[PDB]
Structures are given as structure tokens and as C-alpha cells.
Amino acid sequence: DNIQVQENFNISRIYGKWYNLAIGSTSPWLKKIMDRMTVSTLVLGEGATEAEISMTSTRWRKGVCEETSGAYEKTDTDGKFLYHKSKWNITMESYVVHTNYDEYAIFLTKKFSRHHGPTITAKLYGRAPQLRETLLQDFRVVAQGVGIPEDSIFTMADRGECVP
Ligand code: NI
Numbered sequence: 001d002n003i004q005v006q007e008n009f010n011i012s013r014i015y016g017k018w019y020n021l022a023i024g025s026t027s028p029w030l031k032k033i034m035d036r037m038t039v040s041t042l043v044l045g046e047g048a049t050e051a052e053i054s055m056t057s058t059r060w061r062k063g064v065c066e067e068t069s070g071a072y073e074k075t076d077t078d079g080k081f082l083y084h085k086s087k088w089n090i091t092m093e094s095y096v097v098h099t100n101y102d103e104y105a106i107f108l109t110k111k112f113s114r115h116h117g118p119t120i121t122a123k124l125y126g127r128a129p130q131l132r133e134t135l136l137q138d139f140r141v142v143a144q145g146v147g148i149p150e151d152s153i154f155t156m157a158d159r160g161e162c163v164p
Contacts, residue, residue, distance in 0.1 A: 009079030065162030
């Protein structure tokens with residue numbers, strides 16, 4: 001199951017703050033800990049170079065509020081990004097599969113392995129912490145569409161944002 005970006009993807013309009021609201025994955029590990037996950041925040045912006053997109057993600061992982069900063073590279077395909085550190089053995093591609101910029105975005109991430117085929121992870125983001133069931137429904141057909149089982153899709157509890 002091969003993956004297409006949102007048409008006419010407009011990168012400057014994806015910048016700013018988002019809330020992770022729903023998640024699914026083919027990963028077994030994620031399925032066990034997909035419950036214990038709550039609403040996280042993602043900030044996106046222009047990178048150090050023109051060829052990067054900077055990003056910061058803030059989460060509850062057990063006790064601590066984690067603030068994770070990373071940087072993806074743009075590719076030749078608008079709305080498709082790459083994070084690659086070969087030495088660490090890490091290769092992930094993520095795709096903005098659908099977004100209307102000012103309300104929601106749906107990301108699909110492929111994380112690659114030497115030992116099995118990629119983990120496919122789907123994340124739904126809102127510009128607001130609040131869901132809207134009808135979006136959740138579409139998010140499900142998107143995730144199932146790329147092979148994420150009915151189970152393995154979870155909605156996240158909103159427990160607010162956290163300074164670390
Ligand atoms: Ni290995």
C-alpha cells in the first residue's frame with residue numbers, strides 16, 4: 001500500500017501549532033501503549049536551512065513532560081519529508097496525506113527496518129484540542145486504507161499542555 005501526499009501542498013500554511021488527537025499504527029508496541037497516550041502538541045516551522053522543516057513535540061511520557069525537537073528534510077515531493085540518520089539506523093518518511101491547514105491535518109509515517117517491512121503510523125492533528133467525531137470517522141478510513149486494523153486506532157485523552 002503506497003502513499004500519496006495532499007495535492008498542491010502548501011508548506012507555509014502547515015506551520016504553527018497542532019494537537020495530536022488520534023493515532024493508529026501497525027506497530028505492536030504502539031498498540032499496547034496507544035491508550036496511555038494523551039493529547040500532544042506539535043509546532044512546525046521553517047528549518048535551519050531552506051531544505052529542512054523544524055519541529056517541536058511536547059508530550060506526557062509517564063511522569064515527565066517531554067519536549068522533543070527534531071528536523072525533517074524536504075524531499076522532491078511537496079508534503080513529503082524525510083528523517084534519516086543512517087548511523088543510528090533510522091529512516092522515516094512522513095506524508096501529509098490530508099489537511100485543510102486551518103483545522104486538521106492527517107500524517108502518515110513510515111519507519112523502516114532491516115528486519116521487517118515498515119511500521120505505518122497515522123496521526124490526526126487539529127488546530128484545536130477538540131475532536132469532532134466526523135473527522136475521527138474519516139481518519140479511520142484513511143488509516144485502514146493503508147493497512148491499520150480497526151483496533152489499533154485510538155483517540156487520545158485531552159490532559160492539557162505541559163511546560164517541561
Ligand atoms: Ni538490527
